[PDB]
From Swiss-Prot:
Residues 239-461 form the N7-MTase domain. Zn(2+) 15 binds at H200, C204, H207, C222. The lineage of its organism: Viruses, Riboviria, Orthornavirae, Pisuviricota, Pisoniviricetes. It is found in: Host cytoplasm; Host endoplasmic reticulum. Zn(2+) 16 binds at C395, C414, C421, H424. Zn(2+) 14 binds at C150, C153, C169, H172. Interacts (via N-terminus) with DDX1. Interacts with nsp10. It comes from Severe acute respiratory syndrome coronavirus 2 (2019-nCoV). S-adenosyl-L-methionine binds at D274, I275, G276, N277, P278, K279, A280. Residues 49-230 form the ExoN domain. This is Guanine-N7 methyltransferase nsp14. Residues 357-371 are annotated as: GpppA-binding. Mg(2+) 1 binds at D67, E134. The active site is at D67, E69, E134, H211, D216. It catalyses: a 5'-end (5'-triphosphoguanosine)-ribonucleoside in mRNA + S-adenosyl-L-methionine = a 5'-end (N(7)-methyl 5'-triphosphoguanosine)-ribonucleoside in mRNA + S-adenosyl-L-homocysteine.
C-alpha cells in the first residue's frame, strides 16, 4: 500500500469523446501502453506514471494542472494549457503563444516547469481532468525510465536532454528538451457527476472560463485543492523544509509574546479570551491576567462568523466584551473592537504560499493550511499594529561590531534615560529582523484602536 498498482482499474468514460470505442474495462498498465510508454517490468523507483490521492497530497507543491484542447489527433494542432496560465500551440507540420512544432514546444515546457518548480519540489504532478488528448500528447514531451540523479548535483532527475544524452533536476535543466519521469493524477477518477466547470463552480467563483486550455488547467488544480485541502483536511502530513520555515515560525512566536505582553501592560485588561488552536499555550506566561482558552480549529473553507464563535446553545456564553480577545491565526469575518489579531494575507507571493480555491491560498509550512481569502473589511473595528520593540530586561551585555542605536520605537529604560545600551540594541535589531521575516511571509497584525505604545514608558519608574 505505497504506490498505485498498474493493475488498478481506470474509468474510461471521460476519455470516450476524444477516444471513441475505448474499452470500459481498462487498467493503468493498458492505458500507459496506449500512451506510447514501455515500462518493461521495472523495479527502479518509478512503478507507475499515475499516483494515489494520498501520494498527490504529500506532493501538492509539485501540482501543475494540465489540459490539452484539440484546436482543429495527429493531423491537427493542439492547445497545451498549464495552471501557470501558459497556453502553447503545438503544430504537427492567459498567456497565448502561436503554433510551433513539438521540437521547440518541448523546450518551452521544460523551461516553464523548471522555473515554476525548482524552489518548490523535487518533481512535477500533472493534475488532469482527462478527456484523451492530454494523455496521448504526453509522448511528445515526456521520457520515462529508471530513477536517476542530476548530472550537476545529488537531486533526483526531472529533465532529459537529447542533445547531450544527460539528466538534470529543475535547477540545472537550461537547454533540456524532455520532462523525465513526471507523475500524474486524473481528478475524474475520484467519482464526479458532470463536467469540470460545473463541479469547479460549486466551490469557486474566482476562476472563470475564458474557454482556453489554461483556464481548464487552473480549474482542475483548483478543484483538486478543494477536495484534498478544503473539504478534507489532514494536519498529520508533514512537508519538507524548502525555505525560511524555521525562522518564520520562530519569528511568529517572538512577535506574539511581544505584542500580547505589551497590550496587557499598556491597557491592563483583567481577562484575555484566547480563541483558536485547541493546543495553544499562554504566549505571556508571567502576565497577571485571567487567561481563558476557546477551541477552534483553523478554518479552511470560509472564515468563521464571529457570531458562531460565541454561540452557546441553551447556556450563556463567556463575556467576550470584557478584557481583550486574541485571534492568533483564527480567521473570522469581522473581529470585535477589543482584539489583538494575526491574520495571514493569502495574496502574498512566496514559495510557501500556493494558489488556492475561491481566492484562498494553501500555506505550506510543516503542514498544509488552506486559508480563506484575505478580506480588509474583517478589520474595520481595528487598526494596523505598528512596529515597536519593548523590553523590561536589565541593561546587561554578556558574552558583532557596534554602531549605536537611535530609534523612537525601542521602548526600553536605556532609551527613556537617553541612550540605548548594547544588549537592547542587539535585541532590537534581532526583533526587527524577526518582525520583517513574519510580515514578508504574509502575516498581518491588527490591534484595538486605543492601543498606544506611549503607555509603555511608565512601566519604567
Ligand atoms: C456552550 N459554549 C459556551 C461557551 N462558548 C463561548 O463562550 N464562546 C466564546 C468564545 C470566545 C469568547 C467568548 C465566548 C461556546 C459555547
Ligand atoms: Zn541538479
Ligand atoms: Zn477555482
Ligand atoms: Zn538597555
Amino acid at each position: 500500500p505505497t504506490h498505485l498498482s498498474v493493475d488498478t482499474k481506470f474509468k474510461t468514460e471521460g476519455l470516450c469523446v476524444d477516444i471513441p470505442g475505448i474499452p470500459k474495462d481498462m487498467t493503468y498498465r493498458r492505458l500507459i501502453s496506449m500512451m506510447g510508454f514501455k515500462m518493461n517490468y521495472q523495479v527502479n523507483g518509478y512503478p507507475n506514471m499515475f499516483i494515489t490521492r494520498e501520494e498527490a497530497i504529500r506532493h501538492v507543491r509539485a501540482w501543475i494542472g494540465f489540459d490539452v484542447e484539440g484546436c482543429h489527433g495527429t493531423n491537427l494542432p493542439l492547445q497545451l494549457g498549464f495552471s501557470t496560465g501558459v497556453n502553447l500551440v503545438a503544430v504537427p507540420t492567459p498567456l497565448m503563444y502561436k503554433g510551433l512544432p513539438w521540437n521547440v514546444v518541448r523546450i518551452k515546457i521544460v523551461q516553464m516547469l523548471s522555473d515554476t518548480l525548482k524552489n518548490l519540489s523535487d518533481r512535477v504532478v500533472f493534475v488532469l481532468w482527462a478527456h484523451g488528448f492530454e494523455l496521448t500528447s504526453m509522448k511528445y514531451f515526456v521520457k520515462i525510465g529508471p530513477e536517476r540523479t542530476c548530472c550537476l548535483c545529488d537531486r533526483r532527475a526531472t529533465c532529459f536532454s537529447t542533445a547531450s544524452d544527460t539528466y538534470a533536476c529543475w535547477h540545472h535543466s537550461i537547454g533540456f528538451d524532455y520532462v523525465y519521469n513526471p507523475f500524474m493524477i486524473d481528478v475524474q477518477q475520484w467519482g464526479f457527476t458532470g463536467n469540470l466547470q460545473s463541479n469547479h463552480d460549486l466551490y469557486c467563483q474566482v476562476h472563470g472560463n475564458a474557454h482556453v486550455a489554461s483556464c481548464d488547467a487552473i480549474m482542475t488544480r483548483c478543484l483538486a485543492v478543494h477536495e484534498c485541502f478544503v473539504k478534507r483536511v489532514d494536519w498529520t502530513i508533514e512537508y519538507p523544509i524548502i525555505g525560511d520555515e524555521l525562522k518564520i515560525n520562530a519569528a511568529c512566536r517572538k512577535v506574539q509574546h511581544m505584542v500580547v505582553k505589551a497590550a496587557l501592560l499598556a491597557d491592563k485588561f483583567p481577562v484575555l479570551h484566547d480563541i483558536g488552536n485547541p493546543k495553544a499555550i499562554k504566549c505571556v506566561p508571567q502576565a497577571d491576567v485571567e487567561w481563558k482558552f476557546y477551541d477552534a480549529q483553523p478554518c479552511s473553507d470560509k472564515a468563521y462568523k464571529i457570531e458562531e464563535l460565541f454561540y452557546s446553545y441553551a447556556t450563556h456564553s463567556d463575556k467576550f466584551t470584557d478584557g481583550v480577545c486574541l485571534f492568533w491565526n483564527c480567521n473570522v469575518d469581522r473581529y470585535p473592537a477589543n482584539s489583538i489579531v494575526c491574520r495571514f494575507d493569502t495574496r502574498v507571493l512566496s514559495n510557501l504560499n500556493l494558489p488556492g480555491c475561491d481566492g484562498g491560498s494553501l500555506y505550506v509550512n510543516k503542514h498544509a493550511f488552506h486559508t480563506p481569502a484575505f478580506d480588509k473589511s474583517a478589520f474595520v473595528n481595528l487598526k494596523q499594529l505598528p512596529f515597536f520593540y519593548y523590553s523590561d530586561s536589565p541593561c546587561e551585555s554578556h558574552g558583532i561590531d557596534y554602531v549605536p542605536l537611535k530609534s523612537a520605537t525601542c521602548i526600553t529604560r536605556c532609551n527613556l534615560g537617553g541612550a540605548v545600551c548594547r544588549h537592547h540594541a542587539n535585541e532590537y535589531r534581532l526583533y526587527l529582523d524577526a518582525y520583517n521575516m513574519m510580515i514578508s511571509a504574509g502575516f498581518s497584525l491588527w490591534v484595538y484602536k486605543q492601543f498606544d505604545t506611549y503607555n509603555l514608558w511608565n512601566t519604567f519608574t
